Amino acid sequence: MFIKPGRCPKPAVQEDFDAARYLGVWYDIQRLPNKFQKGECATATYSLSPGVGFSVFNRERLANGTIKSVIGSAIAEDPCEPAKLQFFHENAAPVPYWVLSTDYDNYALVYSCINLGASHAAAASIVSRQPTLPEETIKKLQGTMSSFGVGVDTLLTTNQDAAYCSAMN
Amino acid sequence: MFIKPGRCPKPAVQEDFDAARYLGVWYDIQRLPNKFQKGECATATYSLSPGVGFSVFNRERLANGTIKSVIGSAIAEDPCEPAKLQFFHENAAPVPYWVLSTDYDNYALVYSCINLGASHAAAASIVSRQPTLPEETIKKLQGTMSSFGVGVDTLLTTNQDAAYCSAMN
Amino acid sequence: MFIKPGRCPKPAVQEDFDAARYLGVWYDIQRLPNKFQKGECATATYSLSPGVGFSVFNRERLANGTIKSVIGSAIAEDPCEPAKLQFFHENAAPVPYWVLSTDYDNYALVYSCINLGASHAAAASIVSRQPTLPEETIKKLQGTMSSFGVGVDTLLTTNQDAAYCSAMN
Amino acid sequence: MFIKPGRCPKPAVQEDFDAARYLGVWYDIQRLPNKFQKGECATATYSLSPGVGFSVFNRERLANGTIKSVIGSAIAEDPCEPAKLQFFHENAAPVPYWVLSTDYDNYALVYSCINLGASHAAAASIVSRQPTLPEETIKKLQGTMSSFGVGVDTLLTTNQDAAYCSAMN
Ligand SMILES: C=CC1=C(C)/C(=C/c2[nH]c(/C=C3N=C(/C=C4\NC(=O)C(C)=C4C=C)C(C)=C\3CCC(=O)O)c(CCC(=O)O)c2C)NC1=O
Ligand SMILES: C=CC1=C(C)/C(=C/c2[nH]c(/C=C3N=C(/C=C4\NC(=O)C(C)=C4C=C)C(C)=C\3CCC(=O)O)c(CCC(=O)O)c2C)NC1=O
Ligand SMILES: C=CC1=C(C)/C(=C/c2[nH]c(/C=C3N=C(/C=C4\NC(=O)C(C)=C4C=C)C(C)=C\3CCC(=O)O)c(CCC(=O)O)c2C)NC1=O
Ligand SMILES: C=CC1=C(C)/C(=C/c2[nH]c(/C=C3N=C(/C=C4\NC(=O)C(C)=C4C=C)C(C)=C\3CCC(=O)O)c(CCC(=O)O)c2C)NC1=O
């Protein structure tokens, strides 16, 4: 199920979020079941933007070996709340993007929730600067999610095997 | 599935919508699969409000014979667009309510869609001032929906049988 | 003036706000300069609503003795933040209404800010269950506003002299 | 003044708007009174963005010869309405930006309105690819604004005299 009961949670975000250090490539390690990622080998590339915010380039290897991509823009509409962002993708409506925790150098936890009456629809990914994350960090970012309701048993481990994700090199 | 592909449509609404005549009791005849209606015998009661807009009282007979109810408030945030309303229910986030077509005296078609990136989540009900609607009107309000994408084959015919909905009298 | 430099602040609101004990009649003691109050002797009557939230009745005397009034509906769009309400006045667009402090029985502090780029337009009023309030309360509620950037030297003391306000039976 | 009575209009926008042909340098010819332009010789440079939308560079001369500038990002939040854009300027909150008419090669009409209860605050500018525009074009774009309530007698002609604007290499 993608519509989970209950309204959107209001989890804590990363304090003094430095977007400049958050830039670069991030590998999807574990993700909540979503409908936008239709393949595996997912990567998020955050690069510089001429105006405000940063740019977004997302890539995945579909099962047919085809690499699908989406471009987008990221802005924190409240500059005093830099970790709560709004992501504007192509052919898409504005979606929320909240950095809950990151070291900028190894791990990152991201959350998106849109309210639907008394139900909600959420997106979550555990990302790494490498195609793998230590199990300790995964178990700790999984506890941050369990703390505000997420069934960390619904999490899907994204395939990042070097031989399968070879077209993404 | 409750998350359908594609963004929210922008269908046409009832012209010169008179909310005063739309007040009263409406019976659910056919509805898109939703998560808020967990029973049958659904009824919508729109009554007067002391300030702006009108009040909302929704009732259904659950399978245990229990009548569940929800109260709410309805406001058209744009007075020059009176058919595009916002419904504020209890323990719920603000949801959209658009009257697409009504005679005020027999039939009414309602639509709610919230965007979720490149996907959407929608609610739809064909309502009648009586527990039944003629099949001609159902087939015509079903064509208005087919015209903007709705799979009118996903529609659920709400049970309004007099003997089963007897606790709602 | 009315459009002041700087984005809107996000002040703290009253905790465990009870809109039921907030119901009744509030008299304007002091107000930030605004464009909707074109008179004095102002009163805000918060009443009950059949649906969600409370009803609004705002009354004031103009310099020509005429009593002008407005009706509106008040709704907390997030039930988990019931002190951050939205006010839907007649012939008017949705405007914010935040109860920052209230003892329900004597005083209340209210703030409204809409963002206008790098500037803002704000409304704030100190209210009482009586046509007067003690200087100690006025001075502490002024210190709360001062903490978030409000020039308390721009505030205007509303006229609540029973002789001037005699048309308010 | 700046806060004018009445809610915001919903004017018509340019059809099949091409943001690519809209890119480049636009000079301010005439403008509605606003609080962000504190000088003259104004220019808006619309450039390319690595993600969604275009970049913004707004430049003006102050009475003291200093050239003040702002950077921002422009995004059409609804891809099916690309002429209704949102502008995210630096140190500023999201503000609306609507291209109502443009031939891309000579003229453009732009409007912004945020609602302030039963009042409103609006921004509008007539732009040219040259520091001047023909009276026939100015007069037709004034008639478009006049159709939706804009007092064209409040408009201000921006100074684009090459001698005064000499600091703009
Ligand atoms: C409910 C919230 C919600 C979010 C957050 C969201 C994001 C989002 N991700 C997308 C694609 C994508 N998103 C990713 C990857 C990621 N995306 C991430 O949020 C992160 C951190 C990764 C992980 C690396 C990839 C690889 C694509 C491209 C998929 C494709 O083109 O097939 C798109 C493009 C539209 C689409 O193809 O469906 C959107 C809007 N959509 C939503 O509905
Ligand atoms: C995606 C949009 C969307 C809408 C529109 C929506 C409406 C909505 N309908 C509700 C209940 C209800 N709604 C109805 C009935 C109706 N409801 C109607 O929209 C109409 C026209 C009928 C038909 C008569 C009933 C009977 C209940 C009470 C269900 C219960 O309490 O068990 C509630 C209360 C919260 C809940 O119990 O889930 C909401 C928010 N929720 C959404 O997520
Ligand atoms: C930027 C935010 C903002 C707010 C909050 C706002 C409220 C607001 N107050 C109004 C009327 C009014 N408002 C009040 C009274 C009050 N108002 C209060 O919120 C309180 C506490 C009092 C004081 C007791 C009165 C008396 C009127 C009617 C004035 C008249 O009709 O002459 C109206 C009706 C529109 C109008 O008459 O112009 C609005 C929208 N307007 C805005 O632009
Ligand atoms: C209510 C709506 C609204 C809008 C649209 C708006 C735009 C806007 N224009 C700005 C700067 C600016 N705006 C412009 C120029 C232009 N601006 C234009 O949209 C166009 C067409 C020109 C003219 C060519 C310039 C030159 C500056 C910088 C002024 C300076 O720094 O002194 C800023 C930065 C904040 C500031 O410097 O105060 C904003 C938010 N602000 C608002 O409040």
Author numbering:
A (entry chain A), B (entry chain A), C (entry chain B), D (entry chain B): 20 to 188
Quote the study on this structure.
Sandercyanin (SFP) is a BV-binding lipocalin protein found in the skin mucus of the Canadian walleye, Stizostedion vitreum (formerly Sander vitreus). BV associates non-covalently to each SFP monomer in a ZZZssa conformation and is stabilized by aromatic stacking, hydrophobic interactions, and water-mediated H-bonding inside the lipocalin-like beta-barrel fold of SFP. The binding of BV induces tetramerization of SFP via interaction between amino acid residues from adjacent monomeric subunits. Using a combination of designed site-directed mutations, X-ray crystallography, UV/VIS, and resonance Raman spectroscopy, we have identified multiple conformations of BV that are stabilized in the binding pocket of SFP.
On excitation with 380 nm and 630 nm, Y142A showed a red-shifted fluorescence with maxima at 685 nm and a fluorescence quantum yield (0.004) equivalent to the monomeric SFP variants. We hypothesized that the mutation of the large Tyr into Ala created enough space for the D-ring to rotate in the tetrameric protein giving rise to dual peaks in the red region of the absorbance spectrum. To test this, we determined the crystal structure of the Y142A–BV complex at 2.65 Å (ESI Table S1†). However, to our surprise, the BV adopted the ZZZssa conformation in the crystal structure, with a water molecule accommodated in the position of the mutated side chain of Y142 (similar to the V71E structure). The similarity of BV conformation to the wild-type protein could not explain the observed differences in the absorption spectra. In contrast to the wild-type protein, BV bound to Y142A shows loss of fine structures of several RR bands in 532 nm excited spectra, specifically four bands at 1695, 1647, 1625, and 1596 cm−1 associated with D-ring in-plane stretching vibrations. Significant broadening of these RR bands strongly suggests the occurrence of multiple BV conformers bound to Y142A in the solution state. The increased stability provided to the ZZZssa conformation of BV by the residues of the neighboring subunit may be sufficient to shift the equilibrium towards this conformation in the high concentration of the protein in the crystals of Y142A. Hence, we conclude that both conformations of BV are possible in the Y142A variant in solution, even though only one is observed in the crystal structure.
